Design a protein around this ligand. Structure first.
Ligand SMILES: OC[C@H]1O[C@@H](O[C@H]2[C@H](O)[C@@H](O)[C@H](O)O[C@@H]2CO)[C@H](O)[C@@H](O)[C@H]1O
Ligand SMILES: OC[C@H]1O[C@@H](O[C@H]2[C@H](O)[C@@H](O)[C@H](O)O[C@@H]2CO)[C@H](O)[C@@H](O)[C@H]1O
Lengths: 136, 136
């Protein structure tokens, strides 16, 4: 699957975004993973949910609203395992996005932009990708 | 050309490492470029020269010695142009590495590990690559 990966989407409460991939290099060198929920197909459009994993280090979450990054949310949760394939499940809940890694929730981000405004998802940085699916 | 790109090298004063590539996404989203001069072929080996461009933002340079990152050197020079192919020339001088962008030097990093200890170069993160050459 092509990386960067860019897809049109429609999301509502009850949607799940499933992403299966593998880091391209060892964790010691801090590969990244980035998943961005965009308001338009344009790459520089606003971002309702920015999810950036610094593998082996930390996770950063934010929104970009009218071209401006807002309040950063940090996590030190690092359930990802060096060299391993991972399954990310991003659950769209009424109040927040919830990010599961291999079936358990480790990260949460309350909605700042209504989820009905999301029109595109981009998955990119230092991973190979074998699955990207938005639930029906 | 495959990215991550990993090659065995031998360097001395007078060597030039030429890298031609293009960012994979727009600068507004901060793609990165990383070039690491390693002491062994192993990916987690020590790094004589770590050169990381946060496109549209800043550049970070450092060494990793006996598995420990040392003193970070920061630059705000950003000669790279959004969406454009770039030509990086890393000159190995007696005292330092000098990084040229499109034929002019913008970054410098004094040797902390002898250059004769460098055995591998890895080029990776959010670029496509069309040329990687170590001068003869
Ligand atoms: O917040 C997401 C946003 O972060 C920007 O970088 C932050 C960095 O995470 C933080 O540690 C530092 O203090 O401020 C930086 C902003 O100047 C990234 O530039 C951007 O791409 C997003 O990842
Ligand atoms: O110095 C290169 C090294 O940087 C690490 O990240 C730094 C970051 O650049 C700096 O702004 C912050 O204050 O400290 C961080 C270290 O905790 C990266 O983790 C590493 O991969 C290299 O890029």
């Amino acid at each position: 699957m092509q990386v960067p990966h860019t897809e049109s989407v429609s999301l509502s409460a009850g949607s799940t975004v499933t992403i299966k991939g593998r880091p391209l290099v060892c964790f010691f060198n801090e590969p990244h993973l980035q998943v961005d929920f965009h308001t338009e197909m344009k790459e520089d459009s606003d971002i309702a949910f920015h999810f950036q994993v610094y593998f082996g280090n930390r996770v950063v979450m934010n929104s970009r609203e009218f071209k401006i990054w807002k309040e950063e949310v940090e996590s030190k949760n690092m359930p990802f395992q060096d060299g391993q394939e991972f399954e990310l499940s991003i659950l769209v809940l009424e109040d927040k996005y919830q990010v599961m890694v291999n079936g358990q929730a480790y990260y949460n981000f309350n909605h700042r932009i209504p989820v009905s405004s999301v029109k595109m998802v981009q998955v990119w940085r230092d991973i190979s990708l074998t699955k990207f699916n938005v639930s029906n």
